[PDB]
Design a protein around this ligand. Structure first.
Ligand code: CHL
Ligand code: CLA
Ligand code: CLA
Ligand code: CLA
Ligand code: CLA
Ligand code: CLA
Ligand code: CLA
Ligand code: CLA
Ligand code: CLA
Ligand SMILES: CCCCCCCCCCCCCCCCCC(=O)O[C@@H](COC(=O)CCCCCCCCCCCCCCC)COP(=O)(O)OC[C@H](O)CO
Lengths: 165, 221, 42, 215, 83
């Protein structure tokens, strides 16, 4: 905050680049954030919470980094981790049906949503936001113009429509 | 002049003066309009040169102990992959003469000297020949260009006295640097995917090409 | 430094320092002489 | 030609704490130990600069006395000429009086002289201690650098062997080193749980270990 | 055309504006004549559209105020994690 006002302050045209701002805030802020949180839930929250709901004492639960360095430790709870990322790259996503489930309802053990459901939800949200962030035009000719999109919508009742907004 | 993925905006400022210039700037990061902070084109070229030099050191330093251990030159206990030498303690740790944090403090102090001096050359050119520093400041005057200071300390053999030789050597340096940082990124990605070291990856690719590829490594380890 | 001391002399900063010192003094007095309903020294 | 008793300010091209940088405009080299080190701009006001210079001088002298009184008795105990010296436990020893009454007496006695020094700083020359002999002329001393018969019985200041500025920077530099040393000793006595010279002995041997990172 | 357009060192970091209350506008920097001025000083503090008519300075103040708000939020989160 001190730097971007007292030392290196953006110009007006930097702030008025709404298309690049929307692209970065839909693909880099929401999409990448949801993807990273889905990665945390898949790699950390799911095994730790499985151990907690299994009645294992919290101090005896393996540390979250131990389930990253040891893939077999995560594979005991979810066997699909033994296959690596090849089911993702071969579009055999149904192999990931042990930690990515559309179950719904609540967990009877904890009374909350299934964490696998939240992981799949955040993954799908990340995909949707990432493909929803390549919409608006920038330095390369592909993309949409917000001004043209607004000016293209005008009806008989509204006259000139959304032009000038 | 050869151009690789050149742009109309990119050619407006990349005129071939800088070494290793091929017009490649799709994002326009070196645009001289609205320039400030660390986005200055001179600072960007200087950072490219420094990163290239450090990666040319690192791409050989991260693979030499493995090759020497395979060849049996110096003891195999010191011959480890680059992540097994205490850089990443979960990946592996070696018992040196000092604690890794003590070595970090020593490195931080030495490079703080050797790099804040370079930073003050960048801020004020020729400012390190004035203040007394062990009598070595006479070799720290520089030449006005921060990336290529020269002098009896940084250019002792006097390579590239001729201007065309200097330009050719600058082009060679930037090209080998770019290749080396590509190699360092490859080292990092291969460690993330395979986790056996880059020289072991090369040996596995040489032993069989089909079974050991990027395609047959997505299972990770 | 003169401008910073002038800022320290403005009303909210000086009031905050004065009232914080007063509150600390009252709190320490209430710790060392707790539950005071009368003045029994005389 | 003779002995100059006035401080000579350092030239503007003096060595700095951060070579290649511009020294601040309020540090012109007229103060002892002037290396242009003021990132926060605390010495912008000249009156506060004088007060901070006097405070630095006082902290320097007290820190040098403190570190001497820590190290020399500790060096004597390690040699063996002190039976049970421990500077950390020295405050909790048994003396001829309670620490509270000793503190009150020390407060009164020291607040006499600290307050005479305050009056001298506020009004230079208001308090004079050097005798006014019938034909001896007393030179006017600088504030914070007094001394005729008592404080400067050696006449090592006032331009004698090393010029006044040189000796003043020497004093200030040794004082800064002593302040850093005393703060280090205070932290080491509660971190390492040992003495200063013992810590130095275990650091000199195998310096790769026995550090801040191994308690 | 979408580049990084940034000007270097537009505002000097100093405590001179700290020593003068109500520096942002003109009718308030003249000094207090009544007590109402004090309330006005806390009413137009973040009304950047009334201080200046230039959109660039307003946008820069908005950006840095957002940064300060994010710093406060991170401080609060650190406090909750510590407690
Ligand atoms: C002015 C600086 C001063 C400093 C830095 C210290 C520093 C210290 N004292 Mg001391 N003291 C100081 C003045 C005085 N002390 C004491 C009387 C004591 C006592 C009675 C004790 C200390 C103790 C301690 C330790 C506190 C933990 C610490 C080493 C404690 C200790 O045992 O650690 C060495 C302790 O119990 N000090 C008196 C008389 C009231 C002082 C008067 O100026
Ligand atoms: C002024 C010089 C000074 C010197 C010579 C020493 C000397 C010593 N210290 Mg102390 N120390 C100092 C200041 C100093 N200290 C300060 C300012 C602090 C904290 C505020 C500490 C806190 C401290 C700790 C917590 C420990 C020591 C310990 C030790 C040993 C070094 C190993 C280490 O881990 O500590 C390095 C610790 C630091 C916090 C670095 C402080 C350095 C200051 C900021 C500057 C000194 C640099 C300067 C160039 C001095 C000149 C060197 C020489 C010419 C005198 C060594 C006997 C260790 C020990 O004895 O374990 C067995 C240890 O555990 N010191
Ligand atoms: C993909 C990268 C990216 C990201 C992550 C963001 C993210 C953000 N921007 Mg946006 N922005 C971008 C690109 C990006 N922006 C571009 C290209 C432009 C110019 C067209 C803008 C223009 C813009 C403006 C004008 C403003 C923002 C604001 C914000 C913040 C509001 C959301 C919020 O606070 O949630 C909370 C989010 C987080 C704390 C999660 C972590 C995000 C980290 C901390 C941010 C690092 C991102 C940064 C872009 C990259 C580093 C630069 C490098 C030199 C260090 C948020 C930190 C608003 C603000 O709050 O500013 C302070 C604001 O005023 N943005
Ligand atoms: C270290 C960073 C780096 C930097 C600062 C530069 C700097 C420069 N390049 Mg060089 N270059 C690099 C690497 C770099 N290059 C590499 C690796 C190659 C080979 C592919 C080249 C090949 C090259 C060509 C062919 C040309 C240039 C040119 C330019 C100039 C304009 C472009 C620009 O502004 O770059 C600024 C760049 C950045 C700030 C780098 C960071 C960008 C993001 C953060 C990268 C993230 C990628 C990374 C792989 C992902 C992270 C994963 C990791 C965690 C594992 C400028 C002098 C032009 C020229 O005129 O030369 C003088 C030109 O024509 N470069
Ligand atoms: C209408 C006015 C009013 C009055 C007269 C009192 C009166 C009192 N309050 Mg109550 N109180 C009030 C409103 C009032 N209160 C309100 C609005 C609240 C809620 C915020 C409280 C909550 C409250 C608490 C939580 C406590 C009291 C207590 C006290 C007692 C004095 C505290 C103390 O120990 O002083 C000691 C003496 C001094 C601080 C004198 C200082 C003089 C300086 C040092 C100068 C010396 C001169 C040279 C006293 C019975 C305390 C108690 O224990 O009650 C029995 C206490 O703990 N009050
Ligand atoms: C900076 C001021 C300073 C201060 C506050 C202290 C404070 C103290 N000294 Mg130290 N000391 C200092 C400098 C200082 N010393 C110097 C310069 C030396 C010369 C190397 C010593 C040598 C020293 C010795 C030899 C002894 C102390 C001891 C004492 C303690 C009580 C003795 C005493 O003060 O009354 C005595 C008063 C007289 C005027 C007589 C007390 C903790 C004593 C101790 O450690 O307690 C068990 C003790 O044996 N000190
Ligand atoms: C650490 C080094 C040091 C240095 C270089 C200086 C330097 C300066 N001081 Mg400062 N001063 C110091 C420590 C120091 N001081 C301390 C600890 C105090 C508090 C007591 C003071 C308080 C002070 C006063 C009150 C005065 C000065 C003055 C001066 C000047 C005199 C020259 C000098 O002191 O001799 C340089 C050499 C030494 C300091 C050697 C160290 C002394 C050893 C350790 C012990 C002395 C030996 C022996 C026990 C004494 C004789 C015994 C006898 C009593 C029977 C010079 C500008 C005078 C002034 O500025 O007037 C113009 C002034 O009168 N100083
Ligand atoms: C690396 C080289 C170096 C050099 C060339 C100098 C040079 C000098 N020192 Mg410095 N000094 C250094 C490192 C160095 N110092 C270090 C690492 C420390 C510990 C922090 C000090 C602390 C120091 C003190 C305490 C004193 C000097 C003093 C002196 C000067 C008196 C010369 C004698 O004779 C001389 C200009 C003297 C001085 O002028 O200050 C009063 C003095 O008393 N120096
Ligand atoms: C989001 C804001 C926030 C809030 C509302 C609180 C709230 C509280 N804190 Mg927590 N805290 C926070 C952030 C926050 N904290 C952060 C970021 C940290 C990490 C450093 C801590 C670490 C912390 C500690 C270590 C302690 C508290 C304590 C307290 C209590 C107040 C005691 C006190 O400060 O009075 C004293 C107030 C003063 C004005 C004294 C001067 C302190 C200076 C002015 C503060 C700024 C200096 C840095 C209160 C429950 C205390 C506690 O609950 O103990 C039982 C306590 O000991 N907090
Ligand atoms: C009762 C509320 C009546 C609102 C009428 C608004 C109106 O003018 O009608 C518009 C909408 O007509 C309606 O269908 C009105 C719906 C009324 C109910 C609204 C609540 C939502 C259910 C006309 O749309 P258009 O196609 O002419 O242009 C729209 C725009 O500019 C893009 O071209």
């Amino acid at each position: 905050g001190w730097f971007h006002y007292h030392k290196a302050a953006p110009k007006l045209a930097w702030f008025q680049d709404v298309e690049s701002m929307l692209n970065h805030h839909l693909a880099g802020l929401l999409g990448l954030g949801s993807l990273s949180w889905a990665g945390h839930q898949i790699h950390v929250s799911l095994p730790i919470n499985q151990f907690l709901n299994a009645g294992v004492d919290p101090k005896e639960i393996p540390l979250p980094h131990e389930l990253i360095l040891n893939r077999d430790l995560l594979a005991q709870l979810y066997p699909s981790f033994a296959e690596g990322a090849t089911p993702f790259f071969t579009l055999n996503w149904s192999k990931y049906a042990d930690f990515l489930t559309f179950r719904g309802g609540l967990d009877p053990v904890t009374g909350g949503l299934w964490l696998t459901d939240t992981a799949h939800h955040h993954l799908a949200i990340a995909i949707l936001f990432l493909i929803a962030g390549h919409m608006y035009r920038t330095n390369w000719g592909i993309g949409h113009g917000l001004k043209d999109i607004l000016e293209a919508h005008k009806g008989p009742f509204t006259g000139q429509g959304h032009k000038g907004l | 002049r050869p151009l690789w993925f050149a742009s109309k905006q990119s050619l407006s400022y990349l005129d071939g003066s800088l070494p290793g210039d091929f017009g490649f700037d799709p994002l326009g990061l070196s645009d001289p309009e609205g320039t400030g902070g660390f986005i200055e084109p001179r600072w960007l070229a200087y950072g490219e040169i420094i990163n290239g030099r450090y990666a040319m050191l690192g791409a050989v330093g991260a693979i030499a102990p493995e090759i020497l251990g395979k060849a049996g030159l110096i003891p195999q206990e010191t011959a480890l992959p680059w992540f097994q030498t205490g850089v990443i303690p979960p990946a592996g740790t070696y018992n040196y003469w000092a604690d890794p944090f003590t070595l970090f403090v020593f490195e931080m102090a030495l490079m703080g000297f050797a790099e804040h001096r370079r930073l003050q050359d960048w801020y004020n050119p020729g400012s390190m020949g004035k203040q007394y520093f062990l009598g070595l400041e006479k070799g720290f005057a520089g030449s006005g260009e921060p990336a290529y200071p020269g002098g009896p300390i940084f250019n002792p053999l006097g390579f590239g006295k001729d201007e065309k030789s200097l330009k050719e050597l600058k082009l060679k340096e930037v090209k080998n640097g770019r290749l080396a940082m590509l190699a360092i990124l490859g080292y990092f990605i291969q460690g993330l995917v395979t986790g056996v070291g880059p020289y072991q990856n090369l040996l596995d690719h040489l032993a069989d090409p089909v079974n050991n590829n990027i395609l047959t490594s997505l299972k990770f380890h | 430094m003169r401008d910073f001391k002038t800022y320290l002399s403005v009303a909210p900063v000086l009031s905050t320092l004065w009232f914080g010192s007063l509150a600390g003094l009252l709190i320490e007095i209430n710790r060392f002489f707790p539950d005071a309903l009368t003045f029994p020294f005389f | 030609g003779g002995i100059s008793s006035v401080c000579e300010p350092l030239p503007p091209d003096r060595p700095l704490w951060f070579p290649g940088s511009t020294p601040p405009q309020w540090l012109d080299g007229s103060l002892p130990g002037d290396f242009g080190f003021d990132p926060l701009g605390l010495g912008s006001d000249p009156e506060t600069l004088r007060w901070f210079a006097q405070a630095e001088l006082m902290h320097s002298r007290w820190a040098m006395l403190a570190v001497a009184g820590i190290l020399i008795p500790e060096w004597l105990e390690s040699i063996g000429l002190m039976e049970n010296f421990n500077w950390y436990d020295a405050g909790s020893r048994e003396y001829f009086a309670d620490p509270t009454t000793l503190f009150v007496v020390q407060l009164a006695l020291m607040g006499w002289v600290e307050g005479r020094r305050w009056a001298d700083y506020v009004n230079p020359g208001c308090v004079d201690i050097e005798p006014k002999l019938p034909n001896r002329k007393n030179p006017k001393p600088d504030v914070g650098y007094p001394g005729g018969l008592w404080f400067d019985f050696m006449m090592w200041g006032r331009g004698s062997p090393e010029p006044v500025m040189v000796l003043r920077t020497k004093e200030i530099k040794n004082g800064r080193l002593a302040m850093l040393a005393f703060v280090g000793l205070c932290f080491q006595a509660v971190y390492t749980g040992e003495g200063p010279l013992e810590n130095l002995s275990r650091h000199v041997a195998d310096p790769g270990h026995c550090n801040i990172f191994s308690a | 055309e979408v580049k990084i357009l940034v000007d270097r060192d537009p505002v000097k970091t100093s405590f001179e504006a700290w020593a003068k209350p109500g520096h942002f506008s003109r009718t308030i920097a003249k000094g207090p004549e009544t007590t109402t001025w004090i309330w006005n000083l806390h009413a137009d503090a973040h009304d950047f559209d009334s201080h200046t008519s230039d959109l660039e300075e307003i946008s820069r103040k908005i950006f840095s105020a957002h940064f300060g708000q994010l710093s406060i939020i991170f401080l609060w989160l650190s406090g909750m994690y510590f407690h």
